[PDB]
């Protein structure tokens, strides 16, 4: 219905692999800086991190699977542990954090811990086999 197909230009495709999946990890990353100093908020946006990278950990494995190359899939499968863990470490210290509020190094391991998970959900978004 109206479609730049190769209308205005050479069709129109977005996104990467796991875009919209990645998307949301990054996302909602930023909400628990912004929930913080509720402690229910916090670790729902946490729930919600785990929930998106269990979509990627399991898709990675398969997308990397489908590769034709040995060391691009060690990568796909490595990055996939990397975030899974990454996210780990973050949603345990998004608990601790929320319902510990006011407690320094649950905010501490939780900066550095969200963050990390930011990047391994970036650093996936980025190595998402296209193509």
């Given at each position: ?69 040995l060391e691009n899939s060690r990568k796909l499968l490595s ?53």
């Amino acid at each position: 219905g109206i479609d730049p197909f190769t209308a205005h230009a050479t069709g129109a495709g977005p996104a990467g692999r796991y875009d919209q999946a990645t998307d949301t990890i990054l996302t909602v990353t930023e909400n628990i800086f912004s929930s913080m100093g509720d402690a229910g908020e916090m670790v729902r946006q946490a729930r919600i991190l785990a929930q998106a990278t269990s979509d990627l950990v399991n898709a990675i494995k398969a997308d990397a699977e489908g590769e034709s190359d040995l060391e691009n899939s060690r990568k796909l499968l490595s990055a996939a542990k990397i975030l899974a863990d990454a996210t780990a470490k973050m949603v345990e210290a998004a608990k601790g954090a929320a319902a510990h509020p006011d407690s320094e190094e649950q905010q501490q391991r939780l900066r550095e811990a969200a963050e990390g998970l930011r990047m391994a959900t970036n650093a996936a978004a980025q190595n998402a086999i296209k193509k």
